[PDB]
Amino acid sequence: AHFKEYQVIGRRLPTESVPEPKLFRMRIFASNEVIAKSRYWYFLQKLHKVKKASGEIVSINQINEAHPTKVKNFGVWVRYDSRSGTHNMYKEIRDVSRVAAVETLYQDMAARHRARFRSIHILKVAEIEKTADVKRQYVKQFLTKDLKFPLPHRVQKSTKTFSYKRPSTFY
RNA sequence: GGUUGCGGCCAUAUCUACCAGAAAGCACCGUUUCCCGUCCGAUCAACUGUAGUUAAGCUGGUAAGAGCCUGACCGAGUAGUGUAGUGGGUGACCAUACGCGAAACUCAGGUGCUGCAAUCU
């Protein structure tokens, strides 16, 4: 579904010798809470000696975008598995939210490298609104002062199967 | 607490090399008339409590000791693996989901514990 940024705070189960464990937290983009808690145990199993059975999740929360109607430059660092091996890349994309850029990121990763969600780890989603922090020319071109372009060859959708005049693609 | 006899678990007890051991206790031990097998009273058998021997046995301590034992979010949730998909990949194989989960390695700690009957300044 629509990716939602969840904060997931969990810990290892409290034993007698070690009450109050170290309370690790992650921000993971997921469709829903069930996948959020699942993705949490998957990564926390990767960085620590803990699995779902031996730990508990102490807080699950949604993080909302601070201002969902300002467009920003998002610096995305990702590792993914291709058929041959593993690679780390830094991509970047315009958006208004962290989540929709991550939705965009998974679409681009699937399209350009045939990477399924199973294969992708989102290392760090970073926002910058200051130029010269933007490295990719496919994003720099929308930051030129006084941007303006046409939308040539406008194709208009037809509700009916027949029309009674050749179409016009003017704009 | 030492020691002896009988033990239990059977190295946290073994192994190497040094250092120490008061009283209690093997025996430094001494002897061959007697029971007792032989080349050998060395082992084994029997007889004594002697110069007074702790030299050895034994016990303890030491050693960035070997070994052994215990533990660890140490490696490592790794390897492996139960279940699942009309997942990926030509394949070889791999990723993912729900579970189980090592061994090496590394780091620490530990040098037997203990039952019964006696005996001991």
How far in angstroms lies nucleotide B54's C1' from the CA of residue A153?
Answer: 115
A45 touches strand B (CB under 7 A): yes
Nucleotides on strand B lying under 7 Å from protein C-beta: 73, 75-78, 85, 87-89, 91-92, 94-101
Q: Could you tell me how far CA A90 lies from the centroid of its own chain?
A: 13
CA distance A44 to A55: 10
Count CB-CB contacts under 10 A for residue A78.
Answer: 22
Resolution in A: 2.3
How far in angstroms lies nucleotide B27's C1' from the CA of residue A136?
Answer: 95
Q: Which residue has the tokens 């430059």?
A: A73
CA distance A157 to A162: 12
A41 touches strand B (CB under 7 A): yes
CA distance A125 to A76: 5
CA distance A86 to A119: 9
DSSP state of A156: P
Closest nucleotide (C1' vs CA) to A44 is B77
The rounded radius of gyration (Å) of the Cα atoms in chain A is 22
- Whether residue A75 contacts residue A44, with contact meaning beta carbons closer than 8 Å, is answered with no
For the segment 63-82 of chain A, residues whose CB is within 7 A of strand B = 81
- Whether residue A94 contacts residue A39, with contact meaning beta carbons closer than 8 Å, is answered with no
Shortest CA distance to A30 belongs to which of A61, A1, A65, A71?
A: A1
DSSP state of A54: T
Closest nucleotide (C1' vs CA) to A43 is B77
Q: Which residue has the tokens 């996948």?
A: A35
CA distance A102 to A107: 8
b/e per residue A20-47 (b: at least 16 CB within 10 A): ebeebeeebbbeeeebbbebbbeebeee
| A64's tokens | 């909302």
**To 5 degrees, how large is the angle CA A3–CA A8–CA A13?**
145
Count CB-CB contacts under 10 A for residue A98.
Answer: 24
By what method was this entry solved?
A: cryo-EM
- Whether residue A9 contacts residue A25, with contact meaning beta carbons closer than 8 Å, is answered with yes
